[PDB]
Amino acid sequence: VLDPTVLTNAITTISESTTQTISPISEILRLLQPMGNDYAAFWKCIASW
């Protein structure tokens, strides 16, 4: 199974969800996805092998 909550708890300790929001939030804007996407592009990438 694929659960991003482990790395979310690891990135929360250095999250700083307030201002100077240039670098670290732009990571998790394309890294969190609770309802953002399914993990299809990973399994699609295995199936192409």
């Binding site: 482990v6 300790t13 250095i14």
Partner: protein
């Protein structure tokens, strides 16, 4: 010797194939900053004053008196014994269900154990921690952030700082000599003969 990073890890880089690589990667960094105004300090460092008849030996003896009559100076000292003995007995709980983990004696090794995964040890060490906080009646954050990476199987607390000229200290902390862990080792030894 500019202290670029101050480095603390949960997992030691030994059982993980991680010893030769750089210490910025083998630990986690304390990133904090306090932007204090120099304009506030100049009209503080050049500006403060005390009274004329003040003597700091009498001042401090009156000043620190209501904060040493309390028992809080001894509280963190008797939590360090509890934190250590929670840490050894949860290191030993994981490393005995694992096959040849840390250098711990394994008296229950005749018993069957199959699922030795990371979530397996996570459901052991949290089950140790929940059965340790309840037993010694404390509600603090004992052993909770140690499972942050998701791997209690390899968990040795270490600390370091990387100076700019490549220097490092790597003064890692081992656990101290335990007493309740050696009781559990004796309970497990008499278990196998009297199951």
């Amino acid at each position: 010797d500019v202290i670029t990073n101050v480095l603390v890890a949960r997992v030691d880089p030994a059982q993980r194939g991680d010893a030769a690589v750089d210490i910025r990667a083998t630990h986690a960094t304390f990133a904090a900053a306090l932007p204090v105004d120099p304009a506030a300090i100049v009209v503080a460092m050049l500006c403060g004053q005390t009274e004329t008849n003040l003597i700091p030996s009498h001042h401090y003896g009156k000043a620190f008196a209501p904060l040493f009559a309390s028992n809080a100076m001894f509280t963190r000292n008797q939590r360090a014994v509890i934190t250590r003995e929670a840490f050894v007995c949860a290191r030993s709980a994981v490393a005995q269900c694992q096959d040849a983990g840390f250098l711990v004696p394994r008296p229950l090794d005749a018993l069957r154990q199959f699922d030795v995964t990371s979530a397996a040890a996570a459901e052991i060490m949290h089950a140790v921690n929940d059965a340790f906080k309840t037993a010694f009646d404390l509600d603090g954050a004992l052993l909770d952030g140690l499972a942050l990476y998701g791997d209690p199987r390899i968990a040795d607390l270490s600390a370091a700082y990387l100076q700019y000229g490549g220097n490092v200290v790597r003064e890692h902390v081992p656990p101290g000599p335990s007493h309740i862990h050696r009781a559990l080792q004796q309970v497990e030894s008499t278990f196998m003969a009297e199951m």
